[model samples]
Each structure stands twice: as C-alpha cells, then as structure tokens.
Target: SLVCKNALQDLSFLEHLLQVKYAPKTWKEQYLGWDLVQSSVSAQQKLRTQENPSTSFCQQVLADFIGGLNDFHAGVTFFAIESAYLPYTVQKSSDGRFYFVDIMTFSSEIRVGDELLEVDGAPVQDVLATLYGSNHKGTAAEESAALRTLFSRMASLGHKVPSGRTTLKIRRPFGTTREVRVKWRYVPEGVGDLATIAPSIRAPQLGYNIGSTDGFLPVIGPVIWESEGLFRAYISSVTDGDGKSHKVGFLRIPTYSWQDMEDFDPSGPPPWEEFAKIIQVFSSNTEALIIDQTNNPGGSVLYLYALLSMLTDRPLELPKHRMILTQDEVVDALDWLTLLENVDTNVESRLALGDNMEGYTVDLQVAEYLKSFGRQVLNCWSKGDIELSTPIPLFGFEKIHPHPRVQYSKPICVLINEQDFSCADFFPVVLKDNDRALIVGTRTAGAGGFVFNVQFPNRTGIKTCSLTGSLAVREHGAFIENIGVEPHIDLPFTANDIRYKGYSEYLDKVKKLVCQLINNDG
Candidate 1:
C-alpha cells in the first residue's frame, strides 16, 4: 500500500517530469488534436480531489494516463511478480483469426497453431476492445498491434488486475472445438523491466523485438552452421528460371541483441566480427542469399552498419533524426561529450576500456556528434523551434561505406515482418532506399526512435516509466514512427499462412522474386 502523503509527492514529481521532460508532448497534441500533457494534468488534479484513493485505483490512473498516449515506448511498467498471464501468446492474423502463436508453457493444453474462438464465453474482439482502454489508435501501423498483445494486457499489463481464472474456448487442429480453463501464472519479475533500448544514439545498442525466429525460412539444404540464438546458416540449391541448379544460402540472425544479457558488452567487438565471419562464407559462390529479420526486434546500430557494410557494394546513407529539445536534453549532450572525453575512471567503464588504446574512440565520436546535434538542438530551442532537422548522427556515423572485408556481392533479400522495430525498421529502410537488397515481407512495427527508461522508487504512484526520447525520419523526410518499413515486394503474412504452410510458400515466392532480380529478365 502506498502512503497517501508519499504518493501525492511522488505523483507531483511524475507530473513535473511529464510536463517538462516528456519529449513527444507537442507531437501527441498535434496528432491527437488533444493536449496529452494537459489531459494528464487535469486527470491528476481530479485524482487529488477524490477521496479514498486506493493502490488499485492509482494503478489504473497511471495505466490509463500513459495508455491514452498509445505509444508502447511511453508507458507504465510494474514489478515482475505483480503481473500474471496464461502460458500462451496469441496474434490476430490476416485471415482475421486469433491464433495461438507461441506456446510459453511446456506441454501446454493449447498448441501453437490452435485458433482462439472465444475467451470467457465472449468474443475475443470484444474482450480486446475492453482491454485496449485508449491504446493502439491514431498510429496507422499500430491499429491491429493490440490484437497481438491481447492476453498480456488482460492478464497483467492493464488498468486493473484481472480474474486469475480465465476460460478460453479454443479450436484445435482439424476444427475440433473445445474449451480450456487456464490459470494465469505469475513469474518473478521486476519494474526494472526489459531494458530494450532502441537505435541508441548514446552508443550502438540493440534494435530487437524479443527478436523472434518468425522470419526464418526453411532452408533447402541441411544446416552448415549454427550459433544458438544469434546466427545460423544453411546452403540450399534452387533451380533458376533456366532450370539450372542455383546454390543459395540462408542466414538467420534471431536478433542483434545478446540472448545472454549478463554476458553482454555493448562496446565489445565480437558480435560484429561474428556477423562478418558468417557473411564471409556466404559471400563466395552464392547465387542469392536471404537474411531473415522477421520477429527481429532490431539491434546494435553499429552492428547494423557492420553487416550492411558487407551486404552492399555501394555507400549507405544513414537515417536523419528529429528530436524534441528541452534544456536537460541540451545539457546532457555536452555532458555526454565530457564523459566521453574524460581520462578518469568512467561511469561507463566499458566504453573506457582498460586497454586504454583510445578506448574513448567510439564514445568520443558519438559524444562529439551528440554534442554537435545538441548544439543545433539548443540553437533550435533558442529560436523557439522544437523539432530540429539535422543529418542524423546514429552510432556517430553520418554515412556507412562498403568495405572489401567479406563483401557479399550476390543478390540479397532481407525477409522482414511487422515485428521488426527500431533498428530492425531501420535495416530494411536502408536496404530499400539504397537499392541494396530486395526487401520482402510485411511492414515493420514503426518504433523508429530511441527510448529512455526511468525507475520510480518503491511505493510511488507507479513502478517505472519509459519516455520515447527521440523520433526518426526517412531520407525523404517521412516520419517513421507510425509509417514503418514498406518492402519492395509487398507480401502480407496472413494467419492462414501460419495455420498451414507457415514459411514454405512465402519463402519460395520471395526466393523466386530474388531470382527475377538476379535474372533482370530478358
């Protein structure tokens, strides 16, 4: 239970943070035609005036307040055990059916391809509408994203705690209808949350979903290489348009993020080299190669640069960025510059390696760029401008050039999906804009910026909060927040596909498309 006095004080602190520090404040108002910041203030004032405010009530207040904005990056998070859910993940597919996609529990009652007919004797759609208070609206790409997170919110991440016992009416394989009542299970978790940052301008960081294996196509040949979560490669023989055997390779990079978080070094050099080494083999005598990025949450911007460097023979232009500037953002920029240039024991000691062989190189470059961008942002603020147009300095690089190291000159096709976010979104954008690879699959979930995670103290109005600190634009100045990566070949991955064929037909179609690109048809 939260102490009323401490709760009010903390709420006031949160209010101050949102009013002055919430980066997308102006943009939300512009898009929604309603002042989010204003609405929050009004809502809070009402909370203060009300009597008998309970912990449960304030939880809803925080959830609804942030949920109204409809940005996943800017939302409230709770302590881990405080949440609960059934051991399954469901997704609404193109066929307009909610299918059980991933089975979280072992030997579960529901299988992966099972169809969800109803939840608690009511239609799933109606259930979702109630669960989605004010979220998954306004943004074009985010419309159906709610259907994807249906159970998670209902079970735990909602305005209020839900009934622990949930009855699910399921349609199993062969259309056998049955009902199963499942208990929402709890796990040891924390408000610290999944530290999933985005195209981190601070340094190269992960752009991954809980980056999944959904985009991996079944290879035509046996697996030649495997590296657990991060890398896998297979050689396949496909008959070309002329009916000649064509040797192609399939590479699966589940995520750019390290699966073993404890073993992660944001500044270490191996992962990029690991990517380089894998592609070094794919470069030789390969007719066409497929890079599966579906379910990829996106990862390391510098790693993106490293892989893209090998993927193309031409120079790649990085994305341009627009950030809403406040005094703190400006001050932090120069402060970052100071931290990078410091010769003392660094707070980010990893960036200041013990090797000391100019360990500050990456940070120094990134800090200098951030400071420069910050200087411009401060100038914009002085001129009473909120959005500053600048050549984006992501991972401290304005442009990426193709290097001879492991140059993969073959026709490349990157299989992307809606789950591709952040740097994953950036990946296909670079490939598409530069005419580098044949982009395939669906539009990415447009989370095209970076996020700042803040942890609230114990017994506050909330547990933790996330703020989308930045927004991004494509080369033509189109905002990537809602409008995601549009593939060169438009393919909608439907629920029916997953229910039956999964990736065979889809992958083959994409393979042939790449074959045509290779043929350039006479």
Candidate 2:
C-alpha cells in the first residue's frame, strides 16, 4: 500500500515536472500553481455545460489545441519517452497486408511505397493491434479505430527504437512470406550494418533464351529498373561500383565506397565519364527506363554538373540569383585556378575571367541584392565563362568524377525515398525542381543542407549534418527533408499491395505512370 501511494506521489510530481519542462519557457515566472486549480475547475464547468460531453472528445480537443505548434518535438505524446511519437505509420488493408509510403532503411531492398506483410506469425492486423494498443488500454471501438487509422497514415523512418531482434512474418503478394529474423543489434556510431533487415524480393533471372536486347552495351552509371520494360544502363550504389554480374564494359569505375580521401585515386576517369558513355549508348532507346537512383551523398558537384551537360538538350542555366563577392571568396576562387589552369583551359579561362574583378566591389553589391531575392549567399566564386566556373571547391580530390549520365535524354523517372539523403537529396530536387524529369516515390531524406565531417575532441570523428537548409531554395517548393520528396504519381500503400510486393510495389506504380506518359501521343 505504501509503495503504491509512493508511486502515485511520484506520478503527481512528474505531472508538475512535465508542465514545467514542456510549457513555453516564458511561463516559468508566471504564477500558474494557484491558477492551475482554478483553471481546472473552470474547465470542468465548461465541459459540464457542453451539449454532448464526452471524455474522449475533450481529450482529443486538448490534443488538437496543442498540436498546432510545429516544433519538431511538440505533440500530445511529448510526455511519452518514445524518441518520436510520430514515427512511420503503416496502413493495413482488409486483405491482411500492410502498406506505407516512404519507408527509410539503409538497404536498397526497402525503398519507398513498400508494403510490410506479417510480423512473426501474426498478420499486418496484429502489428497494428500491438502498435496502437501498446500504450492505451480499454480503448472504445470508435476511439481505437480512429487512432489506428491516424497512426497508420503518418509514420517516419530512422528513429532510436527499443533495441532487440523482431521476427517478422511477412508476405508480399507475388512475393514471399517467411519468418524474417531481424536480430536486434546496436548500430555503432558512424558505422552501420550493411546486413540490416531489408525487404526481400525473390531474385528474378532474365530468361537465357530471350535473346539480349541491344545494342546491349555495358552500363556504368546510376541505373534504376521498374518494369516499363526493364533496361540496365547504369549502377545505383553511392560508394561502390556494381559487381561483375552487373559489370561489363568500362568496368574500370571503382566500387562505391563512402570512406572518403583515404582511398583517393587522382588518375581515375571521372565517375560521370563512365556514365556518359552509358548514356550515349542507351540514349536512342525510347523503351529503356533510366533509373537515376544512385542515392549518393553530395560529393563532386562538378561530376554531376558534367553528367548533366551531356544529358540536357543544352547547357544547364545556373540559378539566376545574383552572385556575391567576398575577398576571401575571390582568393579561394583564384587558388582553384592555379589547379584548374593545368587541367582544362576552358575551366582555367573561366576562373581567370573573375580575376579582373578581384579588387572590385561587385560582391558587396551582389550580396545586398541577393538578400532581396531571398537567396542566401552560400559562397562566392570569381566570374568565368558560364561553363568554366565550378560552384564548389574541388580540392585535392579523392573520388574523381562520380557519374556522367546524371542528366537524362529520354522520358525519365527518378526513384527516391529515405535512403536518398545529402547529395541524394539534390537529385530529385534538381530533377523535379528544374522540370527535367518526374520524381517518383516519397519525399527525399536529404534536405538541401551543407554536410560537415565533425571531428570530436575524443578522436572519434562524427559527421554532423542537417536536412532543413535546402528547404530555403524551394521555400514554397514541393520537397521537404524529414518529410521526403512527393511523387509525380503519388503512391500510398494499401494492405493488399504489401502482402504481395513489399516495397517493390512502388516500381509497379512507376511503370504505370511511365507507360501512360510515353504511350500517350503527347
């Protein structure tokens, strides 16, 4: 009895503590202790006067009132210890399958628009039952149904969840359902498990007798496939090259490796060069699907720029925003020229063009003017022939040219979800933002933000980054980071789709859109 009373008192103390911690910081000095009781009585009186008083409605109304604050952490479950109350949501269809948009896992196997099937021996319904019922008990039929519906529609990926292995009983229709044992393992900082639980699709083999389509050239760029007539003309891994099974001609490109500067090779052909050759070979085939799903973190901005040059009908128009000048900026640009002069004269000449204005006030005026355009000056570079200026510093390079075929010459669809972060974020934004191609899938993980390699005093280096910075360029634009890219053809999961295809359901959606776009006489 004493223990229960103590626990109750502890809960009472915590209630006060939470109010103090979560309330607007400005409320600290306000005398609310006495007013809190009066407010409670008055609130009770108001509730009693309501035409149809219901406890559930009152709680929901209170929750709604607090939900208005859009701070990343504000919500009804602020008191809940869960890292995020609004984690990824899954919709279970009556057919015993589950579906969700934008599932984020590090594996290529789990892309956006995936449907999750059974967990252990239980159906998707079971998972829903556990998820919504874990914290609330004795839920009314109406309340339980409402919460279940809401929860399934708004889940996110990549949260610090309770650690442990969970055996998932899953089935993707036309796919497979087996006991998938996800060993609960702690992901060490900076290091991730490549073998993490992934959506499994039975590997399909191309019919050996179905003579290969050609001029079937070897592809060495970012290639995506989603059944609008499958064509493999590129590779998709960010840090490594595709292996021999997929590797053919121009297999010289190194494997996609994320560890930077350590394995630096200067003489390698730019990654895009390999991509350019692939694009040239495949550009004629209207039936080929160009899957630009490299999901590469931002690096070698020029590599992408060079790749774009080849795909476009013409050169890309740099943002029309004015350029700012800083003395340091000019100096950095000049230093870059010394390296560029010996590399490509065209590039050299571009940097030299800005040299003449080194001592001028051009940057100051540009800075003042850019503010009006709502563009923050990321950095300044000296003037050069429009094609010559590199927007970022390509210092003692490690991974040379990344991919050459980033630009697409035909009807294109880019597939992205959570895994496409950082530079990956840029791909969809550039594709959709410029109207160059249609983006398919959930929003991207990479918000347009500068990525930093953080070195901690403890000698363990940490890379600190953000996804919010990029949102500025497209202020009213369609992309959101924590919120990923929106698909041209929005594909949300249904319960039936998940029982069969798992995450690959998105590929089917993409195919239908492409078929309509290409087949229609437009």
Candidate 3:
C-alpha cells in the first residue's frame, strides 16, 4: 500500500477512491482491474519524480491510462490548451494524401486545395499516427472520421504537441510546395469559459464556417440563415429536369445548450421559441426536411426531447434504463444543497448559486426515482443493493402545446458525421432505430455515455465521466458507447474531393440525394 499524501500521491488512496467513487458497478471488470491500475499508478508516480514535473504531462499520462479502457466517453480533465483561432480543416484522401477543406482564418497562407505534407518536421502521416495513437478506441474508419473533425483545432489538444506554434509543409494547388508556421494565440472572443472573459463578446469558436446572413459572409463558405440565436437554418429548392420542384428545409443545430444563447437574451425568446418559429416556417413552406448535425456537440437533453417532439406527432418514448448512483454522487448532491443554503450575495456568485440549485433539483429527482422503485441504501461506504430500472416519459406536442400551425408531414432526413456525438448521437439513434427518419453521411463519434463533472480530492481542475449512469437504450439491451449509429445511406467523401470540389459541393450532393429520396417516395 502506498503512503497517503496531501496531493493524492498515494496509489492505495486511488484504489480506495475507485472502489468508493467509481459507479456503474461493472467498470472494474470493463475498464481497469487491480493489475492495470497498479501499473498505471506506478507509471504515473515515475513521471512525477522527474526533473521537472509537468502538470500537462501528468494529465496526459492519466488521460491515456483512462483512454486505454476503450471508452471514448471517459476523459481526464486538467486545463490543457486554449486555442485562439483554428486555421484549417484537413482530410485524408483515398490516395493516402492529406488536403485542406475548410480554411477559416488561415486562407491567405493556405488555400482550400493545398495538400498537407508535414507538420513541424514530422510527416503528415506521422502526425496523424500520433493523433490516432493518443486517444481513440474506435475502428480505423471511425478514427479517420473523427480525425477529420479534430484536424482543424489540433492546437486545442495541447498535451499532444509541445507548443501552440505549429509549422506545416504543404503542396499548393499551383504546383509549388512551401512551409508555413501557424501560431495559435488565445482570443477573448472565442473562449468558452464565461468566467475568464467579458460577457458582451463571448462567441463559441465552432471551428467550421457556419455561414452568415449579415449582408456579408463572416467566414468563406455557402450562406446559411443565421437566427437571433446562433441556430442556423437554410432553405432551398431543388428542381428536377422535369417541371417538378421540391422545397427543402435544412436546420443545423450546433448545440443544445441554452446557456450559449443566454448571453444574447436572458429575459425573453428562449431556444424553444426560436426553434418553434423555424419549425413553423418548415411546416408551412418545405416539402422535405433535412436536419444537418454534422459537427453538433450535445448540450441539453431537454432540448433534445423538445426537438424530437416537434418532428413527429407521437410522444417520444424515454429509453428504459436505471440511474446508478454511488456514495460519491449522493455526497455531492448533499454538498450542493449545503452550498445553496449559504450562497454568496454577489451577482456572479448568485448566478452560480442558481445553477447549483438546479443541479440539486435534478439530483433530488433521481433520489426520488430510486426510492419509488424500492431501492435499498446501505452504509455510505457500501454500494446500494437495488437497481432502479424506470421508464421516464418524454411527452410530445400535446403536452408542450406549440402555435396552432400546420404540422410538417413530409419526409425527414438527418445528415450526420463523426462530430455528432453525445446527445447528438442519441438523437439519430432514437430516430433511425425507431424508423422515423433516414440517416445519411458518415458514422457518429460513438460517445453516448452521460457524464458528470468531478474533481479529485486534492486537485483544482474539473473532470467528467459516466460515474453515476449511462444512456439507456429503448427495447434493445445495448448502449451507444463504443458502437455508434451507422448511416442508412452512407454518402462517403474524401479530402481530395473536398479540396477540389469544396465542402459546399459535398453538402449539395447530400442535399441532392435527400431530394431524390423524397421525390422517389412521392
């Protein structure tokens, strides 16, 4: 047994911590056993005793150890890197070549058609090998698909590289090769942490160009209808060579977090209100609807159910699963309640306090659900005996009555890619499996486990994991963790295609395909 220390330097403490804190009872068998945990801690200890102990290095070691479990949902959270602007997006072609697709801020140095050769003296293939080597447990196809989303903001993976300055060797489309250095600096406008920056100028750096409706295009790409909130909707019509034409409604839901829109409007016009308006327009105008969730990072589950409810006439069935809470989560819930009782008076503090109150309410609901199912709670040190398997109701349009408008009774097609993860992954799984909509594009990221923010007893940084519970599957005994939802109509594309044709062209291809499907059904 390792000796206990103030900063959690003891391996014995970690073992004990895992037993007490790590929930989902099966994680011990599924992820780390005693042998693996011993080796990991031994490795971590050796690194800590080095000449200069780097926090980032230690975090990576820990992250890698966790990642080896083949759980994409598992993550170690220490402050790694905060990137200013992502320069470009790259894709690997079928001919084993890397090419730039989406050039955002670095369009001057690198064009869309430039082929990437090397990064910081290392070959592009070597760099990609390193990326795939670090943190992924999926197949080659899934990893490659994920890398397409990750390539743009490589600097954000601070632990992987030495510094923010990255040098790239590229072959230009004009038959010339050159080296360009990209220095990623921290910009105030792009930061996600609201506590670090001013509220007036905080916009999410969503990597890709989400187009604009402000007279001029903010980023270089096809134009999308920008709403008051950042939710973008694109309306277009495709006419066959014949006189037949069909209006298609495309809505790109980037995030489900209402907090993203809170800065714009704290009082009136919520996300649902804005979404309802968009759906109303689609209902009145469009014959076929295509929901684009290419790079959507999930946020609110409530918003997810809300969106699902709007698409169909029936009530959405909640997945049948149980909430497995350990002693740690119960203690965390109690701690939140205690904090709420003596919250600070400042506006900023009060805002945080309100969020805590909401968290406590959610925790209390979980506790009530457990109790209603006759779950037996033992001592705080021991795990509970009863496993609560309850089916929650996700009601439809009738419960949350919308504006009295014509319901959208058209063919629905969902366009997804590897970047569509978490609840975004959940959305399609429910829809596609239930035979409500046809799924297109590439396979999703396959990280569907529900995670909660946690911190080490001696650490200052926040981390998240699926310690208490995971996403539940309806009828099926499987979950969307390592295995992702595959598309019905796989519209595969490569870097070379994007480099030569453009991302807009690929989107147009999918749109055309969707139009064809709708036309055929008619």
Candidate 4:
C-alpha cells in the first residue's frame, strides 16, 4: 500500500518532470504548457481522493487520467511496469460479440474471447457511456478509439475505487447475461490486477491456436495478427479486443510509439525488408488480409508503403494532373506583366514572351505591380527560396508493376472496424485502390491519411487536432474523417447476438469463407 504522503510526493515529482519535458520554454507558447500542468494537478488530486490507495489503485488512477484526454496521444504510463499490461487480448466477433480472445492467466481460468457484458455490476455499455460522455454506437474503430480512452480511465482510477469481489455481468454470444464474480486482490507496489483477481472466470479465446497452421502470427497480445491463405498473405491490426477468433491476422496498432517503431523498425529497411520476405513466404498463398482496428494514432507512413510494396502486383502511379504555379514561374510572370504595362505595348518586340526579365523596369509597371508584387518582393527576402512544386506521382496501378515486391498479383481482404483510424484505416484503402484488396468487416473509423500534432498556445495541454484537409483515397474523393471506412462485407453484432453465444457462428462464417478458398485450391 502506498501512504498518502509518499504518493503525493511521487505525483508532484512526476507532474513537474512531465511539465519540464513536454512544456519547455521553447514550447511554452506553442504547447499547452499551463493546461498540461493543470491537467496533471487535477489528475493527482483525483488520485489522492482514493479511499484506499495501493500500488494497484495508483495504476488505475493513472489509467483514468489518460483516458480523460480522449485524444489518442494522451495515455497513462504503465508499460514500464509489467503489472499494468493486459495478459490477454480482447476481441470482437462478426455478430458484435465482445470476448476475451486470448488467455490472460491460466491459473485464473481466464481464456481468450470471453464476452464481457458488465464490470462490477455495471453494464459494459453503461461504463463506456459514463466514461465517454455518450454512448458509442460507432463502428468497431470508433468504439476502439473511445474504448482506448476508456481503458486509460480504468487504469487511472483502478485503485481509488473500493476493493471487493469484482462482479462481471457477462452474456455469452447467443446466451443470457450471467453473473461472473472476480475477487478483488490488492496489488503490491507497481503491480496490477488481472481477470484472475476477480471472482468470476472469463471465457472464450481471442488469439489464434498456438500451433494453428493458418499462418496467423501475432505480435502483441491479440492485437496484431498475420495470416496466409491460398491466394493471399495478410496482416490485421486490431484496436479493440471485442470480437472472437474470426480473423487469422488481426493487429491492434494503437499508436506509433518508440516501442512500436522498435518492434516494426520503421527507420531502416531491416524490419520492413524482413516483412517483405514474410510476404515472399506467401508465394504459396494467394490471399492476404490486413485488419486495422481503430483510431490508431498515426505512426510511420513509410511502413504502409513497405507493407504495400510486398503484395503489389504492378507499378503503381498516382495521377498528377493538377497544375501548380511554381514560385519562379509566378515571379517571372509578375515581372513580365509589370514590364509590359510600363515599357509600352510595342515593348513586346523588344522582349520575347519566353525572354528572362532580370533587369529593365519602369514607374507604372513598378507602381501597379506593387499591389501584388509588393508583398511578393518584400516577402521574397524572408521566403528565402523559390521551390519547385514537382508532380507528386500518386501510387496507383501503373507504378505497382515496376516495384519488385508488387510482382505478384494476389487476392486480398482487409478487415476494418469503426475504430480503425489514422494510418490503420488508411492501410485498407491503399490496398483497395493500389493493391486490389477486398474490404471486409464493419466500416472503418474513417480517419484516412496522417495527422500532424500541433502544440497549443500557453501549453494548456497539447491539442491534437487533424489537418483541415486530408489525403484523398483513390476514386473516393477526400478521405472522410469522423465517418467510418465502409467494409465490402459489412458485419455488425446484433442485439440477439449480444444476448447469446453468437460469436461462434460469426467465426464459423469467416472460417468457412477462408476454408472454402483453401479447400478448393490447396
């Protein structure tokens, strides 16, 4: 147990450190400096109000504060401590079933894909509603985005709440809600409470069978998955662990953190090159699936290119018809127009249209041009350079051929849920347009393209807002944000499925589809 005094001291120290690191003098005006301070103070105050403060409870408090941000960037710091991490993966089913996809603790009898209905007598939906300020009926990606915030809250406030047997009101797919109790156990300093601590046993597994030969390789918990089928090779990134084991390759890429970069190796070609080799192993396979769960705060865009390069069948070329006036061209045009106005109409004979106008000007041309040219010339000193706006070749079908990785044409299926956001969501679209992949599952949390995080004035806590404009998906004008990415095969959970053991059926459907393809070919 942590004494109030020591805990307070630790809180103060952490806050100061965070402020100094994130809100330095250089960033004071740009970043939300004071706001960050106030938010930290508020979080600390919430921690202090805990009825019984313990190491576990403190972890919960941190989770709650991180959840409150609602932004993907803000999250509780717990990875350093093993106790704070989840032992199993949570997954969603085609029928909208929420269950444990992997075993967290064998000792506790908690397996993967256990449909979670309630936590401590509170309906899971109710809990989410309370935390999110509104009920989340969005697609899986949206739910995941909202739930990530929710989990952060749970982690932060875990210890402050009373300790007792945590009751879970669970409803197996196609079943009634049943009471599952988990005894609350006190976590020693720097430890966390898992499903085992609760009295009730959780059920259903979300991860692939350890030795299953379907080619599903998981990287983190049940979040990331890789699969190989007869005609394709795939990788899926899950955001929320709500569905059952319907996907062979599901990955939950929540954020682009240092750890993720370390695991995926985005900077150099080593990891990405290896990933391409993995796709090479898919030579025997024809189909690939990549599932992007939800609101994955943007990471390296380069990774997408690397992944796409592997499965592309041809050289992809993005259309570049939009004409832009380069600075040099604009400057030349301005000078020509100015000289023509002052020098006289007959000056055309002296100066050819293509001739350079480095020198020779007059009063009228200078004065009249001053209206627009004044700003251009005066700003030129500060502008420093006349950069060329080269045609950015959009990566489409034509360019896909030349790339060595795109030599093979394979069938691809991309699974996206409402929570599939940021780069996670964009992955599927890229495949659909450039790589010719089929979209599946529910609509994606339509956060297409990348987002740039900008610090707010006075450092009132950094404001993470997306750019006003977004990258256009091929064929689809202006990638839509806030709205979800629609799936070619839309699969959503039904109320009845929530009330019964319906997840199994959904799994069977996906299995049958993949197996049909396999049995027919292999």
The candidate that wins on lDDT is 1
Looking at candidate 4, the ten consecutive residues that score lowest on lDDT are 354-363
Off by over 4 Å in 4: 1-97, 106-115, 133-139, 146-165, 171-180, 183-269, 284-298, 315-402, 452-475, 492-522
lDDT digits (tens) for residues 1-522 of candidate 1: 123444556666666766655655555666655565576676576567656565545556666677676555677765434555566667666666878766777766788889999988998877876766464563324545555555554313434545468889999888899899887665433442221221222655691225544333556544444444346666676667678766777786666554333244567755556667767767775677888887766656655666677777777787876666677766765665565565434334345533222211233334445446656665667777655434346534566667555678788888877777777888889888877788887788877677777785756435577777667777777766657888887887576666643655566687677677667721
lDDT at 365 for candidate 2?
23
Better of 2 and 4 by TM-score: 4
| Pairs that clash in candidate 3 | none
lDDT of 3 by residue, 131-156 (tens): 55333454644556445534443223
How does each model score on lDDT?
A: 0.63, 0.35, 0.54, 0.42
TM-score of each: 0.80, 0.42, 0.71, 0.49
TM-score for candidate 3, residues paired by index? 0.71
Residue-wise lDDT of candidate 2 within 148-171, one digit each (tens)? 343222111212234445555544
The weakest ten consecutive residues by lDDT in model 1 span 192-201
Better of 1 and 4 by TM-score: 1
Which 10-residue window in model 3 sums to the lowest lDDT? 210-219
Backbone collision count in every prediction?
A: 8, 43, 0, 116
Ranking by TM-score: 1, 3, 4, 2
lDDT of the structure predicted as candidate 1: 0.63
lDDT by residue (tens digit), candidate 4, 1-522? 234444455555545434322212122223222255565677678666876555555545544544433333333343222212334344455555467645445544443335676777776667655555222333455455545432322323232333445666655544665676665443333333322233353576891221122212223223343433211234432222234333334323343222343234345444444444555544543343343333344455444444555656564433221112234434654664564554433344244322211111212222333234434433443454222122222221223222343333455555455555555655666565564666666665554433433332211111222221123334434433444356666656443332233444444444444443333431
Please list the Cα RMSD from the true structure of every candidate, rounded to 1 decimal place.
8.4, 17.3, 10.1, 16.2
